[PDB]
PDB file of all heavy atoms in Angstrom:
ATOM      1  N   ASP B 105     -32.999  48.047   4.007  1.00 97.28           N
ATOM      2  CA  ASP B 105     -33.218  49.461   3.660  1.00 97.28           C
ATOM      3  C   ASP B 105     -33.334  50.376   4.886  1.00 97.28           C
ATOM      4  O   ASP B 105     -33.225  51.588   4.753  1.00 97.28           O
ATOM      5  CB  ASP B 105     -34.470  49.600   2.787  1.00 97.28           C
ATOM      6  CG  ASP B 105     -34.291  49.159   1.335  1.00 97.28           C
ATOM      7  OD1 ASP B 105     -33.165  48.825   0.911  1.00 97.28           O
ATOM      8  OD2 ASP B 105     -35.295  49.222   0.596  1.00 97.28           O
ATOM      9  N   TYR B 106     -33.505  49.809   6.078  1.00100.20           N
ATOM     10  CA  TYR B 106     -33.469  50.517   7.359  1.00100.20           C
ATOM     11  C   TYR B 106     -32.055  50.699   7.933  1.00100.20           C
ATOM     12  O   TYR B 106     -31.921  51.080   9.090  1.00100.20           O
ATOM     13  CB  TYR B 106     -34.436  49.842   8.349  1.00100.20           C
ATOM     14  CG  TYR B 106     -35.868  49.890   7.860  1.00100.20           C
ATOM     15  CD1 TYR B 106     -36.530  48.730   7.434  1.00100.20           C
ATOM     16  CD2 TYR B 106     -36.493  51.136   7.721  1.00100.20           C
ATOM     17  CE1 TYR B 106     -37.781  48.820   6.802  1.00100.20           C
ATOM     18  CE2 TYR B 106     -37.736  51.235   7.085  1.00100.20           C
ATOM     19  CZ  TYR B 106     -38.373  50.080   6.604  1.00100.20           C
ATOM     20  OH  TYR B 106     -39.537  50.201   5.922  1.00100.20           O
ATOM     21  N   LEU B 107     -30.987  50.449   7.169  1.00101.68           N
ATOM     22  CA  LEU B 107     -29.598  50.725   7.564  1.00101.68           C
ATOM     23  C   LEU B 107     -29.249  50.136   8.935  1.00101.68           C
ATOM     24  O   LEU B 107     -28.596  50.762   9.764  1.00101.68           O
ATOM     25  CB  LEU B 107     -29.315  52.234   7.464  1.00101.68           C
ATOM     26  CG  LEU B 107     -29.494  52.835   6.059  1.00101.68           C
ATOM     27  CD1 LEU B 107     -29.381  54.351   6.149  1.00101.68           C
ATOM     28  CD2 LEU B 107     -28.455  52.307   5.079  1.00101.68           C
ATOM     29  N   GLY B 108     -29.744  48.933   9.204  1.00101.00           N
ATOM     30  CA  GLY B 108     -29.496  48.193  10.431  1.00101.00           C
ATOM     31  C   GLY B 108     -30.125  48.769  11.701  1.00101.00           C
ATOM     32  O   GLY B 108     -29.877  48.221  12.770  1.00101.00           O
ATOM     33  N   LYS B 109     -30.955  49.817  11.633  1.00102.32           N
ATOM     34  CA  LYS B 109     -31.806  50.218  12.764  1.00102.32           C
ATOM     35  C   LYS B 109     -32.759  49.075  13.117  1.00102.32           C
ATOM     36  O   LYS B 109     -33.072  48.259  12.258  1.00102.32           O
ATOM     37  CB  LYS B 109     -32.596  51.491  12.417  1.00102.32           C
ATOM     38  CG  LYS B 109     -31.761  52.695  11.969  1.00102.32           C
ATOM     39  CD  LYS B 109     -30.682  53.101  12.971  1.00102.32           C
ATOM     40  CE  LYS B 109     -30.034  54.411  12.533  1.00102.32           C
ATOM     41  NZ  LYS B 109     -28.981  54.842  13.483  1.00102.32           N
ATOM     42  N   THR B 110     -33.292  49.018  14.334  1.00101.73           N
ATOM     43  CA  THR B 110     -34.508  48.223  14.564  1.00101.73           C
ATOM     44  C   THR B 110     -35.692  48.936  13.934  1.00101.73           C
ATOM     45  O   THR B 110     -35.744  50.167  13.933  1.00101.73           O
ATOM     46  CB  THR B 110     -34.749  47.875  16.032  1.00101.73           C
ATOM     47  OG1 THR B 110     -35.879  47.048  16.131  1.00101.73           O
ATOM     48  CG2 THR B 110     -34.998  49.077  16.934  1.00101.73           C
ATOM     49  N   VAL B 111     -36.626  48.172  13.364  1.00102.08           N
ATOM     50  CA  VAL B 111     -37.788  48.694  12.649  1.00102.08           C
ATOM     51  C   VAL B 111     -39.029  48.434  13.476  1.00102.08           C
ATOM     52  O   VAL B 111     -39.216  47.349  14.022  1.00102.08           O
ATOM     53  CB  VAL B 111     -37.834  48.167  11.213  1.00102.08           C
ATOM     54  CG1 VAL B 111     -38.202  46.694  11.080  1.00102.08           C
ATOM     55  CG2 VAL B 111     -38.805  48.966  10.362  1.00102.08           C
ATOM     56  N   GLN B 112     -39.853  49.455  13.634  1.00102.29           N
ATOM     57  CA  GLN B 112     -40.879  49.543  14.670  1.00102.29           C
ATOM     58  C   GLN B 112     -42.233  49.855  14.057  1.00102.29           C
ATOM     59  O   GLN B 112     -42.294  50.438  12.981  1.00102.29           O
ATOM     60  CB  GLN B 112     -40.470  50.652  15.638  1.00102.29           C
ATOM     61  CG  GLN B 112     -39.192  50.344  16.422  1.00102.29           C
ATOM     62  CD  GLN B 112     -38.624  51.510  17.210  1.00102.29           C
ATOM     63  OE1 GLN B 112     -37.570  51.413  17.821  1.00102.29           O
ATOM     64  NE2 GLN B 112     -39.274  52.649  17.269  1.00102.29           N
ATOM     65  N   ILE B 113     -43.337  49.528  14.727  1.00101.83           N
ATOM     66  CA  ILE B 113     -44.645  49.901  14.179  1.00101.83           C
ATOM     67  C   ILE B 113     -44.785  51.419  14.147  1.00101.83           C
ATOM     68  O   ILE B 113     -45.268  51.954  13.157  1.00101.83           O
ATOM     69  CB  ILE B 113     -45.794  49.152  14.867  1.00101.83           C
ATOM     70  CG1 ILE B 113     -45.787  47.710  14.314  1.00101.83           C
ATOM     71  CG2 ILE B 113     -47.142  49.817  14.580  1.00101.83           C
ATOM     72  CD1 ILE B 113     -46.742  46.706  14.962  1.00101.83           C
ATOM     73  N   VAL B 114     -44.269  52.128  15.148  1.00 99.87           N
ATOM     74  CA  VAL B 114     -44.094  53.583  15.113  1.00 99.87           C
ATOM     75  C   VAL B 114     -42.618  53.905  15.348  1.00 99.87           C
ATOM     76  O   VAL B 114     -42.051  53.413  16.322  1.00 99.87           O
ATOM     77  CB  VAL B 114     -44.984  54.272  16.156  1.00 99.87           C
ATOM     78  CG1 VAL B 114     -45.043  55.773  15.900  1.00 99.87           C
ATOM     79  CG2 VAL B 114     -46.409  53.743  16.119  1.00 99.87           C
ATOM     80  N   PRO B 115     -41.944  54.703  14.506  1.00102.28           N
ATOM     81  CA  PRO B 115     -42.461  55.430  13.363  1.00102.28           C
ATOM     82  C   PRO B 115     -42.361  54.701  12.024  1.00102.28           C
ATOM     83  O   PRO B 115     -42.950  55.183  11.067  1.00102.28           O
ATOM     84  CB  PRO B 115     -41.601  56.685  13.322  1.00102.28           C
ATOM     85  CG  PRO B 115     -40.231  56.178  13.735  1.00102.28           C
ATOM     86  CD  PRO B 115     -40.578  55.126  14.776  1.00102.28           C
ATOM     87  N   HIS B 116     -41.629  53.595  11.880  1.00102.87           N
ATOM     88  CA  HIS B 116     -41.323  53.066  10.544  1.00102.87           C
ATOM     89  C   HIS B 116     -42.536  52.584   9.766  1.00102.87           C
ATOM     90  O   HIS B 116     -42.734  53.017   8.637  1.00102.87           O
ATOM     91  CB  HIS B 116     -40.275  51.968  10.608  1.00102.87           C
ATOM     92  CG  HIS B 116     -39.031  52.391  11.317  1.00102.87           C
ATOM     93  ND1 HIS B 116     -38.813  52.246  12.681  1.00102.87           N
ATOM     94  CD2 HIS B 116     -37.969  53.021  10.753  1.00102.87           C
ATOM     95  CE1 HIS B 116     -37.616  52.797  12.914  1.00102.87           C
ATOM     96  NE2 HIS B 116     -37.087  53.273  11.775  1.00102.87           N
ATOM     97  N   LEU B 117     -43.390  51.734  10.338  1.00104.46           N
ATOM     98  CA  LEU B 117     -44.584  51.287   9.623  1.00104.46           C
ATOM     99  C   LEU B 117     -45.619  52.402   9.439  1.00104.46           C
ATOM    100  O   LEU B 117     -46.237  52.493   8.386  1.00104.46           O
ATOM    101  CB  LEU B 117     -45.190  50.079  10.316  1.00104.46           C
ATOM    102  CG  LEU B 117     -46.208  49.386   9.403  1.00104.46           C
ATOM    103  CD1 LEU B 117     -45.716  48.003   9.045  1.00104.46           C
ATOM    104  CD2 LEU B 117     -47.557  49.238  10.090  1.00104.46           C
ATOM    105  N   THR B 118     -45.804  53.301  10.399  1.00106.34           N
ATOM    106  CA  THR B 118     -46.708  54.434  10.193  1.00106.34           C
ATOM    107  C   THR B 118     -46.187  55.436   9.179  1.00106.34           C
ATOM    108  O   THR B 118     -46.989  56.069   8.505  1.00106.34           O
ATOM    109  CB  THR B 118     -47.024  55.164  11.480  1.00106.34           C
ATOM    110  OG1 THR B 118     -45.867  55.682  12.075  1.00106.34           O
ATOM    111  CG2 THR B 118     -47.738  54.249  12.457  1.00106.34           C
ATOM    112  N   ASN B 119     -44.876  55.552   8.987  1.00104.44           N
ATOM    113  CA  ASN B 119     -44.303  56.249   7.844  1.00104.44           C
ATOM    114  C   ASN B 119     -44.592  55.504   6.551  1.00104.44           C
ATOM    115  O   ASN B 119     -45.011  56.129   5.591  1.00104.44           O
ATOM    116  CB  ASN B 119     -42.795  56.459   8.033  1.00104.44           C
ATOM    117  CG  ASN B 119     -42.458  57.441   9.135  1.00104.44           C
ATOM    118  OD1 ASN B 119     -43.264  58.251   9.548  1.00104.44           O
ATOM    119  ND2 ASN B 119     -41.236  57.455   9.599  1.00104.44           N
ATOM    120  N   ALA B 120     -44.452  54.179   6.503  1.00105.62           N
ATOM    121  CA  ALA B 120     -44.746  53.415   5.296  1.00105.62           C
ATOM    122  C   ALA B 120     -46.173  53.643   4.796  1.00105.62           C
ATOM    123  O   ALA B 120     -46.377  53.918   3.624  1.00105.62           O
ATOM    124  CB  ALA B 120     -44.487  51.934   5.545  1.00105.62           C
ATOM    125  N   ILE B 121     -47.164  53.618   5.683  1.00107.04           N
ATOM    126  CA  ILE B 121     -48.557  53.880   5.332  1.00107.04           C
ATOM    127  C   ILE B 121     -48.729  55.294   4.766  1.00107.04           C
ATOM    128  O   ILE B 121     -49.342  55.455   3.722  1.00107.04           O
ATOM    129  CB  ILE B 121     -49.469  53.610   6.536  1.00107.04           C
ATOM    130  CG1 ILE B 121     -49.462  52.137   6.978  1.00107.04           C
ATOM    131  CG2 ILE B 121     -50.909  54.031   6.213  1.00107.04           C
ATOM    132  CD1 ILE B 121     -49.965  51.913   8.400  1.00107.04           C
ATOM    133  N   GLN B 122     -48.168  56.330   5.384  1.00105.19           N
ATOM    134  CA  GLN B 122     -48.228  57.693   4.835  1.00105.19           C
ATOM    135  C   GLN B 122     -47.529  57.797   3.476  1.00105.19           C
ATOM    136  O   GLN B 122     -48.043  58.405   2.544  1.00105.19           O
ATOM    137  CB  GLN B 122     -47.562  58.667   5.808  1.00105.19           C
ATOM    138  CG  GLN B 122     -48.314  58.793   7.130  1.00105.19           C
ATOM    139  CD  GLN B 122     -47.478  59.555   8.142  1.00105.19           C
ATOM    140  OE1 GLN B 122     -47.476  60.772   8.208  1.00105.19           O
ATOM    141  NE2 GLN B 122     -46.687  58.867   8.928  1.00105.19           N
ATOM    142  N   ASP B 123     -46.364  57.167   3.338  1.00102.69           N
ATOM    143  CA  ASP B 123     -45.614  57.165   2.091  1.00102.69           C
ATOM    144  C   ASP B 123     -46.351  56.396   0.989  1.00102.69           C
ATOM    145  O   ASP B 123     -46.227  56.763  -0.167  1.00102.69           O
ATOM    146  CB  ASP B 123     -44.204  56.607   2.322  1.00102.69           C
ATOM    147  CG  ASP B 123     -43.335  57.418   3.303  1.00102.69           C
ATOM    148  OD1 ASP B 123     -43.705  58.541   3.712  1.00102.69           O
ATOM    149  OD2 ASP B 123     -42.218  56.953   3.617  1.00102.69           O
ATOM    150  N   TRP B 124     -47.159  55.384   1.322  1.00103.88           N
ATOM    151  CA  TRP B 124     -48.044  54.691   0.382  1.00103.88           C
ATOM    152  C   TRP B 124     -49.225  55.555  -0.043  1.00103.88           C
ATOM    153  O   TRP B 124     -49.461  55.703  -1.235  1.00103.88           O
ATOM    154  CB  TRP B 124     -48.530  53.363   0.967  1.00103.88           C
ATOM    155  CG  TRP B 124     -49.118  52.387  -0.011  1.00103.88           C
ATOM    156  CD1 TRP B 124     -50.137  52.606  -0.868  1.00103.88           C
ATOM    157  CD2 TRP B 124     -48.733  51.002  -0.244  1.00103.88           C
ATOM    158  NE1 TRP B 124     -50.412  51.467  -1.589  1.00103.88           N
ATOM    159  CE2 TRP B 124     -49.574  50.448  -1.247  1.00103.88           C
ATOM    160  CE3 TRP B 124     -47.748  50.153   0.291  1.00103.88           C
ATOM    161  CZ2 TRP B 124     -49.438  49.140  -1.704  1.00103.88           C
ATOM    162  CZ3 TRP B 124     -47.599  48.838  -0.165  1.00103.88           C
ATOM    163  CH2 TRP B 124     -48.425  48.339  -1.172  1.00103.88           C
ATOM    164  N   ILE B 125     -49.950  56.176   0.880  1.00107.81           N
ATOM    165  CA  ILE B 125     -51.081  57.041   0.545  1.00107.81           C
ATOM    166  C   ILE B 125     -50.643  58.190  -0.356  1.00107.81           C
ATOM    167  O   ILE B 125     -51.225  58.378  -1.419  1.00107.81           O
ATOM    168  CB  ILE B 125     -51.771  57.533   1.828  1.00107.81           C
ATOM    169  CG1 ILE B 125     -52.481  56.360   2.527  1.00107.81           C
ATOM    170  CG2 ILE B 125     -52.767  58.657   1.536  1.00107.81           C
ATOM    171  CD1 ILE B 125     -52.852  56.653   3.973  1.00107.81           C
TER     172      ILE B 125
END
Side-chain angles (χ1 to χ4, degrees):
Chain B
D105 284 354
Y106 298 110
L107 300 172
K109 305 305 188 180
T110 184
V111 72
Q112 294 170 184
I113 284 173
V114 193
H116 306 90
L117 194 115
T118 60
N119 291 340
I121 296 161
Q122 294 169 86
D123 298 350
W124 196 305
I125 291 164

